[PDB]
Amino acid sequence: SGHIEGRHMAGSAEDAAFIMKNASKVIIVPGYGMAVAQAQHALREMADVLKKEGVEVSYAIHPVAGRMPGHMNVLLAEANVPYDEVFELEEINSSFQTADVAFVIGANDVTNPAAKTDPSSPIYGMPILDVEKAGTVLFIKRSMASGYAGVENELFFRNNTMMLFGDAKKMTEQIVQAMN
Ligand SMILES: NC(=O)C1=CN([C@@H]2O[C@H](COP(=O)(O)OP(=O)(O)OC[C@H]3O[C@@H](n4cnc5c(N)ncnc54)[C@H](OP(=O)(O)O)[C@@H]3O)[C@@H](O)[C@H]2O)C=CC1
């Protein structure tokens, strides 16, 4: 069950299910972590349960999310995620404010502004994804560890931010189950 630990909120699979199953608009943010666990098929399934419940789903892709340009796009296509539901940062970063939930699965650095200050990084000087602008922000990852940038993300401590610790694929699978 959920609970507070340190300066962050640690939710559970059911919390995420309850929150999303009851929202009207969710925006999924896929990152490296999703690729490591090959959670794309589970993720698309989740999107299918939500869409069936009337919820509005779309995906926000950051230019350098993952480990190669367009990495998330091919993974989502692989899971048969409808092409029209995937959007690039420049054409959807402003839609976070009108979204109840921001489902951030396996992403970190692509949401953190503190990550684009290193000039030797592929993300240097690039706009970040505005996940905070949404009602609630779910972060699916194994721990409180940093990303490729090695810097700490300050969104893990926000009020509208709930951490869902676990494997990107395993956790998404539990959430799907909890949703039925
Ligand atoms: N796209 C490209 O062309 C390239 C991009 N890069 C760099 O890679 C980064 C991209 O960021 P983003 O996509 O958000 O990736 P990140 O590098 O920020 O990592 C994402 C997060 O995924 C979590 N994770 C790792 N394994 C798993 C797992 N099995 N299940 C669930 N979560 C997991 C990590 O934490 P935890 O251990 O807590 O789970 C991690 O904090 C940027 O710094 C960028 O510049 C580098 C080379 C090329």
Swiss-Prot record:
Full-protein interval shown: 294 to 464 of 464
Subunit structure: Complex of an alpha and a beta chain; in Rhodospirillum, the alpha chain seems to be made of two subunits.
Protein name: NAD(P) transhydrogenase subunit beta
Signal peptide as annotated in the record: none
Record family assignment: Belongs to the PNT beta subunit family.
Cellular compartments annotated: Cell inner membrane
Coiled coil: none
Superkingdom to which the source organism belongs: Bacteria
Function according to Swiss-Prot or TrEMBL: The transhydrogenation between NADH and NADP is coupled to respiration and ATP hydrolysis and functions as a proton pump across the membrane.
